[model samples]
Target: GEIQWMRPSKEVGYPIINAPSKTKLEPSAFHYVFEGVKEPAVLTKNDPRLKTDFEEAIFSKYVGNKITEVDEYMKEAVDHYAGQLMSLDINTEQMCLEDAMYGTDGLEALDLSTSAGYPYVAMGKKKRDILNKQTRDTKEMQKLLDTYGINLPLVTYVKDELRSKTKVEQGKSRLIEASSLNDSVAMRMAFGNLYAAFHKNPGVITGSAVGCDPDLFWSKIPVLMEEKLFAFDYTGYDASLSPAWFEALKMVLEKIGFGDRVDYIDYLNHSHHLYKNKTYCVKGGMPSAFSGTSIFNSMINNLIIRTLLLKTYKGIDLDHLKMIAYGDDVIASYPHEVDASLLAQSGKDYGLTMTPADKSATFETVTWENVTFLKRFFRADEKYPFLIHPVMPMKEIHESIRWTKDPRNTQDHVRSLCLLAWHNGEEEYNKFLAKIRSVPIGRALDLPEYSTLYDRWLDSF
Candidate 1:
């Protein structure tokens, strides 16, 4: 479908109007992750918005070049960072697994702990029963899920973290499995710190980006350019472009020859949901609801991005150009006069196309410094760098809470409010407490206690 992007109006909140492509993709094979209003009345994964499909397709497209494994660059990265992981005490690995876990918050962690050395913290009985009911609700999709050796079934939950007040939902509305997400979470978080260890220094410029802008313009097409241009740019980029993170993570796990822990991520990404009546398997994407997908994308993306810039540019040092992507943030700095045009052109070659915005949004030539994107702002330093502290804004904080009907969701608002404001709000944390105090008897709960819990955690931090 040939879709067009549009500006949001005072009358409407949706960003694009559906005006509806390849592989003769089946209609049922595609679906809108958000089904608020049907676009084609029947959807397929080929919908221009399905950025994951594009990413996977690009991955497959790059698979043709026969990239050889066992590269020096990869070993150099892992060998440098691998030992740092050992610095953590053993108990935390257990706690890390515990904290890393989500959705499958039931006895699975317990099952793994008792059977093996991995430890688990039992969820409270109330939550267990609630998870038990949720566990029961997902029963319909179990049989199909079981074929993949995972029992993760899709269920909906609200936000637990701070979010943009923009498109889609305040918190994502994607369907997540109670257990599958936790599966990815453990794998997702476990491997995330490796990137941080690689560049443990100051002034490594970091930038935040969405996982898959899924829009035809922002992510899908340009990222595909990354897939192709990597090959064109050099094999280092090509080798790095592939699923190096997964293979690297797999390599580390395989060192002692662990069980299906390596494949758990495969099961995690092979997410499926019950739509209409059938179990629809997700062929692409780590999935929006899988929660940790953005980081996974960012991780794999960092491999390709760093390889490209460092290998291509002569002036940029590997240490200075280290853009460590955490979740969605890409962090690294470059020479002041390092030909922004060069990087900007590469950005064009793989990023914003010549003609991207059809919504009357004008495009400008990319330049270094003060890259103001969407709602967030970052100004490139002239020399001395400042900390990328606490990316937080309260414009739409607790706004979605006003409309929720579920008591479970009601608690989420309080937690989300306190979680961000107290943990790291640029403005007054006290005002946030006062704001919660003003939540009259009915609409809001006793949310101030949540502020205290976060306060203790911050002090503990």
Candidate 2:
């Protein structure tokens, strides 16, 4: 055999150029254009090098069998977003909050019905008056000649009755005060000043009266994004789209004054605001963990591309790139092929975009191939092929997907039910459950398992 010589590998380091880092004021201004806003490029439909479908098939089979039958199924169908409302575990303290508000033998025993209604316990002055007049009275008013003897002096008996009246008044006063404090504390803990749910704007974080530390709240978003916690908790998902849920959510949100906030108009507008003139690329189908497809999530997958490209081109121009959410996707409007080439090289190097086995492009020698190239990874024959071509049947499944079996419903209904029951009552629990079980179920699970599953489901707040 003939001897062959190979070039030595170059140690990777900073770009050869030495440009001084500029101060904020001295730095040149950058303007961005959205012209290159191509739709997310799809990857090859199927590629032999990809992992085979064994794992996914196994998971689908297991979840279909084990989880579909749980009570979480039913609850999942209801407003999947309800998870934001409360915790899932059945704790005694939480239950006490509910009993105090609703149970007959609980706070109602003190005739404190004034504060027991929708929204607030009671809201008006008339209601307060009625509650105050409903207290228990002692039987000392008609004791003309007193209990100790047959014929006592009127002055002595009257004085004794007056003393007894004073005691009754004092006892009632203490009872009312204690009841007020209990409810006050419970309310604070349940729906405290903290931003328990969504707020109107990013700036609201600074002005919130709830005492949530602004730094703490702002810091969690990126962490949550990096950890992919939003997918796990289904926090940002809209729940009303579930079967027969749009109307219900409307009623509920309207009642709570958040109906307009979560409405279709807002959803559409948010979509427009975030996705307008943006091009995303899906290197693969939905991740195994994701129940639905996310072009944005897929784009975030390209963060590795950014890292590799920055390393290769040292000081690669990032001016064109817009915000990269979660780091998997890139949003940019490159002015020329060079910028695209940089992104393409990054994509190909990181296995984000497929090139020929020899690593060559078939068409225009752009940095990244078009969506057609992306589709190849998702084709039917490829191992671990992502469903790139056949757009996810989300609209068809969106409603039913809210069910536990659907995998798309991310709300924590079990926790909410447990919490509502703890602080409200069995009636409230039943109401919440009724809303849940009414949503549609996917073929994956039956009704019986759905209910039981929630009772046993692992709880998140």
Candidate 3:
């Protein structure tokens, strides 16, 4: 591994790097691409990774100061989440998972990686050949991942040509024992495919996007609810309980019947990010480098939330609730206002802090300025009971409607609204046209001839 690009260290933000595996680079890393850009644009003043002043009150000061109550809240949440994991475990690993070899065919291309910034690189026969030889220097990775890998020491040993001069130099050494981007993707896909429900992308707003059956109370349609919208983040999420990710993942595998494949679990356990010439290992929780971080995170979150609800509030008939989660940003149209605090409590205990409020949140109706999912804003349906209508998120809505410059952008935005409108009713479609008219004219908000696109996209499933 080698550094492809870098920015110098400064007091405000951590030094970052772009690495493509034979791959190694500076210590700090990232995955949130949109958030990563904010680091450079705002510099230190608005770094996404660091806590802000408002965050002091909102988050109980994660940057430095400690809030004992909030920390205890976090711990109790982990306990419940972990406890739910144990309660659900029932499945039982390992030998060439996709047939005993790290072959080149399905190795495929990788996602845009994030460390300094996101860069994408494809694994061709050449890249794979290079990888094969590199790991060969460590031991047979194919055989190792096949079964015996878990028996190996939990150590990263770099073999140099065995010289005293090697003390300061990290020469052409075989990076040992962790899953690389290629290994992560291939194993995830190969193993995940065993289940009909496992999916590749869990970040989409729709529940089916996560590859789970859509008949789930939250995932199913016309979204009946009397509740308002909200979002919450798993503050210090992945790193907060890094040790539990693989165990949680393993539990999920067992519950879902994939526990027999310990080989896949081994690959997941070995996930790590390279930084400062050291193995910044994934002891637990989702690491940016690992493939399917969103999938695993959402699955674990969904499982815990649902399970917690049943066990804690089992006396109540709470099955009618509706919610959708994409990694960490969760939105639900929960109907039981009298019982809504359970979710708020669930969020806190399981490490989901209110997006704009503290644990002492007063409103039964937890509201926010924008209600968005899969990059579009969704508003409650008042004309009809138990429904939602999608619209472009306000000015991020109107500005595009008014901007004639990019036909593709304008058309796509309009096209999206048109399709979503078709789902609720033509009345919602008329509302979209009204929004377009609301924008200043002359600048064309050329709507896509969306009838066909709508038919096709709706048909897409």
Please report the candidate that would top TM-score against the real structure: 3
Residues 219-308, candidate 3: write the lDDT tens digits. Answer: 333343335443444454433333343455565555545666545555444433333233233333344334455556665555444544
How would you encode candidate 1's per-residue C-alpha lDDT over 1-461 as one tens digit per residue? 00011122222321121111122111220112111222111123443444344223322312222223535554544433333233432121222433333223211222221111001111111224222332334342233234433334332222222223231222122222234433433453444333232223111221224322211112112221211111111211211222334565454443423223556445433443322222334332333344344444554444434434643464444443334343423433443324333443553333211221112233332232222223223332222232222323444343433333344555664566565554334245666556454545223555554346544543432
TM-score of each: 0.43, 0.19, 0.48
> Against the hidden true structure, what lDDT does model 3 obtain?
0.38
Q: How close is each model in CA RMSD to the real structure? A: 14.5, 31.8, 13.0
lDDT top scorer: 3
Sort order, lDDT high to low:
3, 1, 2
Model 2 misplaced stretches (Cα beyond 4 Å): 1-302, 323-331, 339-461
Candidate 2 per-residue lDDT over residues 36-113, each given as its tens digit: 111111111131222334222211211111111112222232222222222222111222333322322212222343
lDDT of each: 0.33, 0.24, 0.38
